[PDB]
Structure formats: C-alpha cells, structure tokens
Amino acid sequence: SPEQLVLTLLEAEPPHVLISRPSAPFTEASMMMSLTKLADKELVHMISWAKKIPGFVELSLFDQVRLLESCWMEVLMMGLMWRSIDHPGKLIFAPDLVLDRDEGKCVEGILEIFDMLLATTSRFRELKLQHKEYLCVKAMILLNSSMYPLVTDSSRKLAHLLNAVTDALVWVIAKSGISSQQQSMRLANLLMLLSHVRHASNKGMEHLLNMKCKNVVPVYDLLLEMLNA
C-alpha cells in the first residue's frame, strides 16, 4: 500500500560508499580501478537493498538472481544520477570522488557514457525529480526487467510488486496537486527516462566487459561474478 511502501523504500536506501581519488594523477588504469572498486562495493550493498523491498525475498531464488543480474548497472547509474542531480557538469560517485565531465577523457569510451549519464541527470533536474519519486523509480528499475520464462507463481508475485510500486509512484505524483493531464505527462516523462537508463546501462556494461578483456583493469569478487554474466 502506497504510503507504507514508500516508507519501506526510504528505509531501504543503501549506505553511501566512501572512496577517494588516488594520490597520483589519474591514468586510464587507475580511473577504472577507482570506478570498479566503487561499483563492486555498491553492488554488495545493492543486494541488501533489494532484499528489503517487500516481497523481493518471497520471489524464487532464480527470479531474485535474474532481476539483479539484469538491472545492477541501471541501479548503480540511477543512484549516481540522483547523487549528481544538483551538480551540473559533475558526477558525484562519492563525497570524495566527484568527477568533472572532462575527466572521462581519461578513459577511452567513457566520456560518451558520462555524457549520457549527465544528460539523463539534467532531464531529471529539469523535471525536478523528488526524493520519493526517485525511490519508486529505482525500485521500478529493479522490478521491470524482461523475464521471458526460464526453465528452472513467482512471476505473478513479480507483477503484483511492480504494480504496487507503480501505484506508489502515481500516488506520490498525486501529491503535487497538478492537473490530471499534467500528472499523466509527468508519469510519462519519468517512465520514458527508463529507456535512457537502460541504454546508458548497456553502454556501461559493454565498456566494462571490454575493459576486462583488454586487462585494462583487474576486476574482483561480486563485480567480476556479475560480469562473467
């Protein structure tokens, strides 16, 4: 139910992961080390986050695993955009890791991704995304991935959840008091941005799968596991 669902998502928010710039000037290698070390740690905390969304741990193990494998980069990115919303031209990876757009020139292929993330962030800024709409949208990203049957009631349980989260978002938007028609347009504007997040996600994934090839960066643990696919 919408108020309680929203409070749960609020209380589910993962901690801020702290990381610092290296002492030496960035290289392609050291910038990627910093971003993947951060991503790996935020991944750890993402699992605990997903587990606190009501109903998530009631889905089957395969379903839990499969939504997380499908959405993790989107969720990393969405949390990054939220952190950065108030800071045009910057990506707020952590309090002490704030990259200027031009810093992406440091790593082949990463400027484009920064630009996509920065543009999606400006669109959220222009829409004046509220905290509670961000909570619902981030949870929607977790729950809204293709599933096509796997061969292994979980799927109806998934639909009910996503339903409830989409209801919660509609409910949040109703608070603004705007016209019925403007409430529909804001919902549409928000959800249409889900494609941009998936699209940046795809470029991020491909970037990291390729880096891992080039041994431009060693990757570890949870992050390496998620990438191994």
Partner: peptide, 10 residues
C-alpha cells in the same frame, strides 16, 4: 556461476 550472489541472497 552466481556462486557469490546466491551466497549474499540466502
């Protein structure tokens, strides 16, 4: 394969 994820979920 999800040797670690399975671990953190369960």
């Amino acid at each position: 394969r999800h040797k670690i994820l399975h671990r953190l979920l369960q």
